[PDB]
């Protein structure tokens, strides 16, 4: 996260770390949506131009974390993966359309002060909250500055950012945008800054509903060009748009 701050402890108890077993590496972020299910970006698991194709046995998830590198005894939980599910129409060849994957844990994880699932939006919530200028929150242990710009946070980072209207997102980049994405971040003339970055992918863009006081995951960190550049905006996977796929997978493969 660029130009964010340190999270408060327990501020984002649905934050998940995807961790490569061997060699040991933080791959990306993820989110906990029930005791057996973690949501992430598909490009974190499958991205063949960079020879990335992780299987279940290649990865672990670390839940309830704050520190990026410490082992948080009696606070974090390590889970193995039963199965990875990638959107069948994830387009890694062009624009990361439908950049979304689910991972089923081997065993259910017990909830705690530090570990607790985020809500997924229903139609009314998405419609009420998905408006230009409305802000969500993005969390992650990704780069603190643009890649090559040279770096890593000590603890989980948090930034709040406004949703940007489609024409502004579309005109910001030559990458082809779809309705399964949205963008967020400040315009140059708004002065304030902040963006997600490399290594933040798969982490949640969340909004707090004033109707019921609950946090909802509206977005998945997906892509961008550099980080925190004037006139660029971070792009997120539009979760409510893909909710019918999410439900389908959980209904078929859940317990």
């Amino acid at each position: 996260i660029v130009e964010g701050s340190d999270a408060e402890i327990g501020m984002s108890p649905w934050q998940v770390m995807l961790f490569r077993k061997s060699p040991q590496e933080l791959l990306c972020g993820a989110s906990l949506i029930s005791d057996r299910w973690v949501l992430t970006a598909a490009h974190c698991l499958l991205y063949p131009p960079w020879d990335k194709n992780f299987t279940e046995n290649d990865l672990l998830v670390r839940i309830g974390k704050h520190s990026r590198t410490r082992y948080e005894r009696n606070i974090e939980k390590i889970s193995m993966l039963e199965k990875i599910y990638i959107h069948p129409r994830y387009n890694w060849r062009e624009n990361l359309d439908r950049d979304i994957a689910l991972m089923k844990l081997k065993k259910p994880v017990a909830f705690s002060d530090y570990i607790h699932p985020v809500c997924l939006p229903d139609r009314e919530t998405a419609a009420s909250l998905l408006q230009a200028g409305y802000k969500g929150r993005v969390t992650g242990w990704g780069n603190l500055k643009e890649t090559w710009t040279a770096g890593q946070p000590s603890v989980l980072q948090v930034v709040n950012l406004p949703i940007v209207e489609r024409p502004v997102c579309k005109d910001s980049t030559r990458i082809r945008i779809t309705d399964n994405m949205f963008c967020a971040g400040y315009k140059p003339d708004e002065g304030k800054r902040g963006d997600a970055c490399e290594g933040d992918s798969g982490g949640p863009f969340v909004m707090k509903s004033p109707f019921n006081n609950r946090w909802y995951q509206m977005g998945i960190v997906s892509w961008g060009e550099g980080c925190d550049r004037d006139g660029k905006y971070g792009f997120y996977t539009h979760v409510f748009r893909l909710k019918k796929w999410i439900q389908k997978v959980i209904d078929q493969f859940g317990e």
């Binding site: 607790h116 802000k135 004033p210 946090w215």
Partner: peptide, 30 residues
């Protein structure tokens, strides 16, 4: 899921984090 989105150390304790008001402000203010 039944209890999703309410954070044990915040909502469940009637405590607010340092920047959540910024989100609400964006939803109400002009």
């Amino acid at each position: 899921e039944a209890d999703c989105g309410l954070r044990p150390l915040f909502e469940k304790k009637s405590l607010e984090d340092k920047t959540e008001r910024e989100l609400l402000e964006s939803y109400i203010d002009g």
